[PDB]
Amino acid sequence: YFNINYFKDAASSGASRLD
Amino acid sequence: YFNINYFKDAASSGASRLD
Amino acid sequence: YFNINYFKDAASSGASRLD
Amino acid sequence: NVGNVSMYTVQLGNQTGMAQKVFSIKVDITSTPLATTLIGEIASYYTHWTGSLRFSFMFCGTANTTLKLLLAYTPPGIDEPTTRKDAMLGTHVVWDVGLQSTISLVVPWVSASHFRLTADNKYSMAGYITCWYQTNLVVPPSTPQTADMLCFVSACKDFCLRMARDTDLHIQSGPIEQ
Amino acid sequence: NVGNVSMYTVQLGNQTGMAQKVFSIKVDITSTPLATTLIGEIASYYTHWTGSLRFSFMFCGTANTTLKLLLAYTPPGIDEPTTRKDAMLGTHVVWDVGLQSTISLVVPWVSASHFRLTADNKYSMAGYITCWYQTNLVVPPSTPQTADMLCFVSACKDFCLRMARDTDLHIQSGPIEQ
Amino acid sequence: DRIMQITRGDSTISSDDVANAVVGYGVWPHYLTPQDATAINKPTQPDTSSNRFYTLESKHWNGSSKGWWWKLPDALKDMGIFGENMYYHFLGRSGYTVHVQCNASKFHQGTLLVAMIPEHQLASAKHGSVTAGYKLTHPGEAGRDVSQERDASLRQPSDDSWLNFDGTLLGNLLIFPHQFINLRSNNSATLIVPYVNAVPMDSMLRHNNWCLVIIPISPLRSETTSSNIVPITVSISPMCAEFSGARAKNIKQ
Amino acid sequence: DRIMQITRGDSTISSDDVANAVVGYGVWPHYLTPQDATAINKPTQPDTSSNRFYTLESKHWNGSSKGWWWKLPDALKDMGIFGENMYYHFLGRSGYTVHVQCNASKFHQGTLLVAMIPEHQLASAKHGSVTAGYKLTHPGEAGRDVSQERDASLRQPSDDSWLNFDGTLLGNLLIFPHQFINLRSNNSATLIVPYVNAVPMDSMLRHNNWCLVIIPISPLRSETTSSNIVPITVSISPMCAEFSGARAKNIKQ
Amino acid sequence: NYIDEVLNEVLVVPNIKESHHTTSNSAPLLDAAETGHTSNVQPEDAIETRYVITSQTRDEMSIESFLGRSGCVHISRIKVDYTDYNGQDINFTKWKITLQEMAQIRRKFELFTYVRFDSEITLVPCIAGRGDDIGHIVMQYMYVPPGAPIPSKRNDFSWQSGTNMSIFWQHGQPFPRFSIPFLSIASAYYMFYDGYDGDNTSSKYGSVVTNDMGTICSRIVTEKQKLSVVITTHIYHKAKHTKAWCPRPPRAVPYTHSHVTNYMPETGDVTTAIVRRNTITTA
Amino acid sequence: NYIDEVLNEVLVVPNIKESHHTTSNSAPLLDAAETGHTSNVQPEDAIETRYVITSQTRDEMSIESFLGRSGCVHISRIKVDYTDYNGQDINFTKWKITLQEMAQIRRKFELFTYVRFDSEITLVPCIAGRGDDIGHIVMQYMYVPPGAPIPSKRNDFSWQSGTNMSIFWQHGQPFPRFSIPFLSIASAYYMFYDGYDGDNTSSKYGSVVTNDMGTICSRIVTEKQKLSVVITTHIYHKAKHTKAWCPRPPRAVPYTHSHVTNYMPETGDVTTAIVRRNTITTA
Ligand SMILES: COc1ccc(N2CCN(c3cccc(C)c3)CC2)nn1
Ligand SMILES: COc1ccc(N2CCN(c3cccc(C)c3)CC2)nn1
């Protein structure tokens, strides 16, 4: 389960990723 | 229903399997 | 909506079927 | 009779008169004497019933004995018939007692509402069934002159119930111990 | 004996009489002496048990020494046998002490219910096992005349448990400090 | 045709008149399968020498008779071989055939209701939580009731018929495998019954699986000399008997 | 290798030392064939529950011991199941396995001759035409002789060994199926024996087909405390038991 | 399946065909019920029937809609105490699992000899305020099979459930509801029994010999409080995935004691549902 | 997998084949247990067995269903004070993580030498009302590994958790429950140890040397209140994704002290579960 930005804005999202 | 590790980390998950 | 045995065990499930 | 077994037999008697009547019960399957019956006991677990029904009678008479009863189903509409002619007019079955022994009377389904209520209701009144002598009970010498007939009721493939509900026929004016 | 080690050995003795009896224990795997055993200790973590079981005995006797015991499994049904003949009638194994040293006795699974309860229950009574002399314990000159036999119990591939529950064999009438 | 012939051991029974035969729950009695099994030993299966036609003690049919029962695993606790194998083994399993004979003449009138019943937990005659006693639900060939008298000190069952002894209006009893003996057509009653129980093989001693009841419904009525006695005789045949869990031997009681 | 393992019922026997085993007349015991048969009924064949390893009463080996015998069809007239089926049936047929155990130490010296014998018609101890009595050739688990005392009023056999009890120089006895128990090598003796008799199935009561004898040849000699008792224990297993001619039940005697 | 299952038309009953008259030999209305069998006669046989296409399902007439319904089988009660907390056999309940201890439902089953099923549960704590404020009251319902440490009193060590099941409910959170297999041991639950404990002329005999699925102990955590309370955690039980073998006559007389069949009032010359008639002639 | 896993038929046991008699040389029933090995004899070997197709799973006999069950391992308590709020070492708890401080569960593990697993947690605050109204009482459970500022008293600065974990629970909201890896450091959790701190004849020695996974400090936010309270936030622990190496004998004697193996009552001449018999001859 993931990438389901339930919210529109980007500022709202999980902790970013890593690379 | 399964394998939906709603959480990122592995330490968080159901009781393992059997084999 | 159905057959989504959210729980592992079989003892936990809806009222069986009919046939 | 009631607290005993007899409460199950119906003795077919003398009858000085002729064309006399035996018994009657009403069809509303939740009505003592019916009720208590495996069926009744049950039906009383549902709010509505339907279909045909089957009444069977057996002669616990003798072998050399003979008789002919007339059984009848008087559909809902009027009063349980006072006389045979009046009752013979509707649904019935003449029963010839003989080498066989069991006559089975069917109770067709006559109703307005596809369905009837299991609970006492003036509307959903299923009617009456009664039994009378067609001829007599003749017995050759040195045979008893009264004998019994057992009666039963099983369903028809017609049959079906619905709307489960808790029973009538059992009040646990307890509790229950240990 | 019990708080010591001996509590583990069974000395095979003299026996003036013949065909005399050694010991007995009951099979209900949650019953001291059994219980405490790696198995028992465990089983007491589950509500139900099943399958066959294995009892093994070893001769801590001498080399020049000799004997022959008869071990038996008396299934559930009656009382632990008072006499050998009576017990020999059911499941058993004659054991010839010799160059080998270990005889293993199997306890078949005899029961009505595929499964037995781990908890003391008159119903799920597994039975008794007992040991007696077949011959004697003969020892040539200047050898002791009593000697010991150790006994053990391991499972069978038959075996299996279920319904986990908290143990019996351990009451923490504590607490526990620091 | 009504005539019937039955052969079970070294024994055979005939009946020039009958009301079919009945197979309990439409299943024919047979031997246990390695699927439903549980035990591990090889069962002893006495064939013929055991599952044969044993006849019990006879009884009188009175105008005062009330009814009499026999409990099967128990009725043959003495019947040779079967009834020894019973006592020598823990696990016992077997099905039966019940031949109920009761004749009189075509000038007689009477009706007997015969029925078998899985787990017939009887009720005590006395109010409370005291269950019927062993020794009284273990009568033997002889059966129980008749319309008899007895100590009320004994944790004694209900001699009570109409309630089914279990307190279920007799008459619904027709749900259990049954048939009648209407002296005007019938002569006997034949019940055949497989092994019913949540376990593959039970204790032939502690547990009686089948329970049989015979109850006069319409009272015997002749016009003859009461010198004319009309017995009721029961005959039984273990079928597909199987035993196991061999050992010493229990004890009679 | 000498070690041996034998499994017969729910029973097994072991022996960490042995002198082979012997099959009587080189024939292995089995069930009767529809060719040599004669009877017409279906024999009951208790398997396992019957043909299992029964052990008798034990005995003492004395420096004064003279010898002791057991008659087989008879030694198990009490051994559960087999020994009931015996009494319930007319015809009985069966073969056996004889495990003779007798240990002591490697510091002991002794020799036992074990032998089975088809039709062992014993002789009476008293001159005449009076044959041994029933009741005395029908001892039971317990066996006979030892070196015992008894009424001479009884049509009593010959307690006489060297003549074979039948009056044939013991020593020619080696013709019957046998083996010894030389305490210096041996531990047991194992005899296995089919059914020998001019008839397909005999009377398990009137006729004892096999007769077994054990005779001290070289007297037991230790240098130990006579607190050291060296028993002799016999164990037996009907094999391929088959019965038939079911009925009431004989009576014990 | 859907439609048939959503429309509930799985088990449908046949229709009543049309008939004509019969002046013929074979009389279907005549059979001999002594055979113990059941007649097979129908409308179409006895009368001059018409033609009715049916549409009644025998869905609700299935051992699963007959059985599969939640029923009070026990009412655990705790009249708390603050005076003595703990103490022996206090402020924590322990009732023996198995019905009987409650009617209605008990009667239902009993309609069959044997039986088997996974049991669904549901709790219904009801906190009665006997004080001027209860607040937060945690609860611990811990099941316990046989041979298991049953708490002597509240805070034993058995309430650690290191390997047992304990469900927790705190005032607010919805009603706990869990399930459960077919437990028992062999094949099915003995709806009766005609066996005993043993040969002991003092042994037990009844459907209490084959059913001892341990006990369940309650206990109200949260500890000592000011304003008192009393709890009544109701219990309902539902049978899901049920099975049935061999049926039997219903129970007309009001039960007695737990386990057992006994009928036998304190005089009540005994009593059944049957009503009395003046005469058979008029109904 | 499903079926096998849903039906729980993963680890099935073999069946018992059929046997016949054996009048043969090799005696399987004879082995010498001194070899330290275990016999391999079976039903089929010893008797004349039949044929039983089995159907018992050894699923529930897995280190995960043996271990994977929640158990009280600690009962944090706070008898609040309103008189002095803050003050040093008050109204905030701090217990040393690791079992022992609780039986049942402790005994379970100890069945093995080493071990390893992710730990699932669950809190169970229980607010006892000692006042005429509690209302809203926030809570802060903040974990703290080693070398970390442990709050001197309630409101330190360590309750900011700028980089620590603090779970918050407010009366109403369900029971908090989080997880946690295998922490430790090397490979697995020392279920025992036969090492010491050092050569100091005053060094430590036991399974308290290899396990110091810091401490966890509680603390009830919300500040000062009127009507008092007392809290008891229970603790349960479950082992998910567990492993096991090398087993060992269970613990029959009631433990002593935390850490350590010590057995040794205050006289109790010592005591074990073994029962006494009159005679070996009758059981
Ligand atoms: C005789 O058949 C039954 C009838 C009832 C029963 N119950 C069902 C309810 N159950 C249960 C219900 C709630 C809580 C706990 C621990 C157990 C116990 C067993 N078990 N077997
Ligand atoms: C010896 O093995 C163990 C045994 C227990 C343990 N615990 C598990 C629980 N855990 C824990 C549980 C709840 C809250 C917090 C912060 C930590 C601490 C470590 N760690 N290692």
Token pair for F131 = 């269950």
* Cα–Cα distance measured from residue E119 to residue E30, given in angstroms and rounded to the nearest whole number: 7
Of D2, D48, D50, D42, the residue nearest D169 (C-alpha): D42
- State how far the Cα of D45 lies from the Cα of D170, in Å rounded to an integer: 11
Q: Is H141 exposed, middle or buried (0-12, 13-18, 19+ CB in 10 A)?
A: buried
| F114 three-state secondary structure | strand
Cβ atoms within 10 Å, residue H181: 16
Q: CA distances (Å), H7 to each of C16, G6, H56, H101, I279, in order?
A: 16, 68, 11, 38, 71
Tokens of I39: 């016999």
Reduce the secondary structure of chain I to three states and give it as a string. CHHHHHCCCCCECCCECCCCCEEECCCCCECCHHHCCCCCCCHHHHCCECCECCCCECCCCCHHHHHCCCEEEEEEEEECCCCCCCCCCCCCCEEECCCCCCCCHHHHHCCECCCCCEEEEEEECCEEECCCCCCCCEEEEEEECCCCCCCCCCCCCCCCCCCCCEEEEEECECCCCCCCCCCCCCCCCCCCCCCECCCCCCCCECCCCCCCCCEEECCCCCCCCCCCEEEEEEEEEEEECCCCCCECCCCCCCCCCCCCCCCCCCCCCCCCCCCCCCCCCCC
G246 to chain I, any CB pair closer than 8 A? The answer is no
Q: How far is the CA of H119 from the centre of ligand 1 (A)?
A: 7
Measured between alpha carbons, how far is D87 from H60 in angstroms, rounded to an integer? 37
**DSSP designation for H181:** -
Regarding chains F and H, contact by 3 or more CB pairs under 8 A is answered as yes
Q: Note which residues in 63-102 of chain E have CB less than 8 A from chain I.
A: 80, 91, 93, 100-102
Q: Are strands E147-155 and E53-59 parallel, antiparallel or unpaired?
A: antiparallel
Q: Which of I94, I96, I97 to mutate to test the pocket of ligand 2 (most atoms within 8 A of CB)?
A: I97
C-alpha span between G186 and G101 (Å, rounded): 10
- In sequence order, the β-bridge partners of residue I185 are none
Q: Are H86 and H220 in contact (CB under 8 A)?
A: no
What is the DSSP track for D30-44? TSTTSTTSTTHHHHT
**End-to-end alpha-carbon separation of chain F, Å?**
45
Chains A and E in direct contact, meaning 3 or more beta-carbon pairs closer than 8 angstroms: no
Nearest partner of F138 among H190, H204, H195, judged by Cα: H195
* R_g of chain D computed on alpha carbons: 18
- In sequence order, the 6+-apart residues with CB closer than 8 A to the CB of F158 are F122, F123, F124, F125, F165, F167, H263
Distance CA F234, CA G220 (A): 64
Residue of F nearest to E74 (CA): F247
| Nearest alpha carbon to residue E51 among H240, I15, G36 | I15
For chain A, give the number of residues. Answer: 19
User: Could you give the dihedral angle defined by the CA atoms of residues F86, F91, F97 and F101, in that order, rounded to the nearest 10 degrees?
Assistant: 40
Which residues lie across from E137 on neighbouring strands? E67
DSSP class of residue F31 equals P
For the CA atoms of chain C, what is the radius of gyration?
Answer: 9
User: Is the separation of the CB atoms in I11 and E160 below 8 Å?
Assistant: no
Amino acid letter, residue G33: T
- H or E element that contains G245: strand G239-246
E133 DSSP β-pair partners: E69
Alpha carbon distance B11, I241 (integer Å): 8
Query: C-alpha angle I61/I64/I70, rounded to 5°?
Result: 115
CA distance I272 to chain C (A): 38
Query: 10 Å Cβ neighbour count for H135?
Result: 25
d(CA G87, CA G42): 17
CB atoms near residue D22 (< 10 Å)? 20
Residue G184, CA distances (Å) to G19, G106, I189 in order: 11, 6, 60
* C-beta of residue D130 within 8 angstroms of C-beta of residue D102: no
What are the backbone dihedrals phi and psi of residue D11, each rounded to the nearest 5 degrees, phi first?
Answer: -85, 135
Residue from F203, F186, F188 nearest F244 by CA: F203
DSSP secondary structure code for residue F25 in this structure: G
- The answer for residues whose C-beta is within 8 angstroms of residue I173's C-beta and 6 or more apart is none
What is the CB neighbour count within 10 angstroms for residue I251? 18
Helix (H, G, I), strand (E, B) or coil at H106: helix
Give me the residue label for tokens 């902790």: A15
Residue closest to G180 by CA, chosen among G235, G231, G236, G111? G111
CB atoms within 10 A of CB I172: 11
β-strand partners of D76 = D78
CB H219 within 8 A of CB H137: no
What are the distances in angstroms from CA D168 to CA D42, H274, I6?
10, 12, 41
Preceding omega of F157 cis (within 30 degrees of 0): no
CB G242 within 8 A of CB G32: yes
C10–B contact, CB cutoff 8 A: no
Give the Cα separation of H150 and H159 in Å (integer).
9
Considering only CA atoms, which residue is closest to atom 5 of ligand 1?
H98
Q: How far is F227 from D50, CA to CA, in rounded Å?
A: 53
Residues of H in contact with F158 (CB under 8 A): 263
Residue closest by Cα to atom 13 of ligand 1: H121
Is F235:F13 a contact under the CB 8 Å cutoff? yes
Q: In what order do the strands lie in the sheet with G4-7?
A: E21-26, E128-138, E66-74, E91-96, G11-15, G4-7, I22-24
Is omega for the bond preceding H247 within 30 degrees of 0, making it cis? no
Cis link prior to E33 (omega < 30° from 0)? yes
Say whether F108 and D150 touch across the interface (CB within 8 A): no
Provide the greatest CA pair distance for chain A. 24
CA atoms within 13 A on the CB side of I221: 16
I43 phi, psi to nearest 5 deg: -55, -55
Q: Which residues line ligand 1 (CB under 6 A)?
A: H 97-99, 119, 121, 143, 189, 211, 213, 216, 237
Q: What's F227's domain CATH number? A: 2.60.120.20
Neighbours of H232 (CB within 10 A): 14
For residue G152, give its domain range.
Answer: 1-253
Total domain count, chain H: 1
Strand partners, D87: none
CB H52 within 8 A of CB H15: yes
| Rama region for D133: left / alpha / beta (φ>0; ψ in -120 to 50; rest) | beta
Q: Where are the beta strands (DSSP E) in G32-177?
A: 54-55, 59-60, 67-71, 89-101, 111-118, 144-146
Residue F50 CA, ligand 2 centroid: distance in Å = 66
SS3 of F215, please? strand
Distance from the first to the final alpha carbon of chain E: 33
Alpha-carbon Rg for chain B, nearest whole angstrom, is: 9
Counting ligand 1 atoms within 8 A of each CB, the residue from H75, H99, H111, H114 with the most, and so the one to mutate, is H99
Q: Are D109 and D51 in contact (CB under 8 A)?
A: yes
Q: How far apart are CA C6 and CA D135, in angstroms?
A: 71
- Would you say I69 and I221 are in contact if contact means Cβ atoms under 8 Å apart? no
User: What are D94's strand-pairing partners?
Assistant: D70
Residue F136 burial (CB count, 10 A):
17
Which tokens in the block code for residue I148?
A: 């970390």
Sort out which chain B residues have CB atoms less than 8 A from I64's CB and list them. 15-16, 18
Q: The tokens of F122 are what?
A: 């009887």
**D138 Rama class: left (phi>0) / alpha (psi -120 to 50) / beta:** beta
Backbone angles phi, psi at H43, to 5 degrees: -55, -55
Q: What is the rounded CA–CA span in Å between residue G243 and residue G86?
A: 8
C-alpha–C-alpha distance, residues F18 and D121, integer Å: 45
Tokens of H71: 């029923």
Contact G50 F44 (CB under 8 A): yes
Q: Could you count the other beta carbons within 10 Å of the beta carbon of residue G135?
A: 10
Amino acid at I79: K
Residue F104: partners with Cβ closer than 8 Å, 6 or more residues away: F61, F110, F183, F220, F222, F228, F230
CB D44 within 8 A of CB H66: no
DSSP states of chain D = -TTSSGGGEEEE---SSSS-EEEEEE--TTSTTSTTSTTHHHHTTEEEEES-EEEEEEE-S-SS-EEEEEEEEE-BTBPPPSSHHHHHTSEEEEEE-SSS-EEEEEE----SSSSEESS--STT---EEEEEEEEEEE--SSS-S-EEEEEEEEE-TT-EEEEE---SS----S----
CB atoms within 10 A of CB H248: 23
Nearest ligand to the C-alpha atom of residue H109: 1
Assess whether the C-beta atom of I242 lies below 6 angstroms from ligand 2.
no
PDB experimental method: X-ray
Residue at F189: amino acid letter: A
| Closest to D126 (Cα-Cα) out of D51, D39, D32, D42 | D51
Domain D1-178 has CATH 3.50.50.60: no
The closest of E159, E165, E171, E155 to E47, measured between CA atoms, is E165
Residue I177: which CATH number?
Answer: 2.60.120.20
Rounded CA gap, I127 and I133, in Å?
11
DSSP letters along G198-239, please? SSSSEETTT---EEEEEEEEEPP---S-TT---EEEEEE--E
Query: What range defines the domain where residue I148 resides?
Result: 1-283
**Coil, strand or helix at F244:** strand
Q: Which DSSP category does F156 fall into?
A: -
For residue F106, the 8-state DSSP code is T
Q: Tell me whether I9 touches chain C (CB under 8 Å).
A: no
Nearest in space to E176 (alpha carbons), one of I104, I255, I110: I255
Closest CA to G194 of G213, G177, G180: G177
Cα gap F98→F101, rounded to integer Å: 10
Query: Number of structural domains, chain G?
Result: 1
- What does the alpha-carbon distance between residue G45 and residue G31 come to, in Å, rounded to a whole number? 9
Residue D128 tokens, joined:
């009456």
Using DSSP's 3-state secondary structure scheme, residue F210 falls into: strand
Sheet containing E102-107, strands listed edge to edge, beginning at the edge strand earlier in sequence? E9-12, E147-155, E53-59, E102-107
Rounded to whole angstroms, the Cα distance separating I58 from F168 reads 44
Distance H184 CA to ligand 1 centre (A): 9
Please give the full DSSP string across chain E, using - where no structure is assigned: -TTSSGGGEEEE---SSSS-EEEEEE--TTSTTSTTSTTHHHHTTEEEEES-EEEEEEE-S-SS-EEEEEEEEE-BTBPPPSSHHHHHTSEEEEEE-SSS-EEEEEE----SSSSEESS--STT---EEEEEEEEEEE--SSS-S-EEEEEEEEE-TT-EEEEE---SS----S----
Q: Which of G234, G209, G211, G230 is nearest to G221 (CA)?
A: G230
> Is the Cβ–Cβ distance between H188 and H115 less than 8 Å?
yes
Instruction: Tell me the C-alpha distance between I155 and I223, whole Å.
Output: 10
Backbone angles phi, psi at G175, to 5 degrees: -80, -30
Bond into H249 cis (ω within 30):
no
DSSP state, F233?
A: E
SS3 G192: strand
Task: List the D160-164 sheet strands across, edge first.
Answer: D116-117, D46-50, D160-164
Ligand nearest to the CA of I188: 2
Cβ-contact F166, F121 below 8 angstroms: yes
3-state SS, F41-104, equals ECCECCCCCCCCCEECCCEECCCCCCEEEEEHHHHCCCCCCHHHHCCCEEEEEEEEEEEEECCC
Give I149's contacts (C-beta < 8 A, 6+ positions apart): I156, I157, I158
Burial class from Cβ neighbours inside 10 Å (0-12, 13-18, 19+) for residue H84 reads exposed
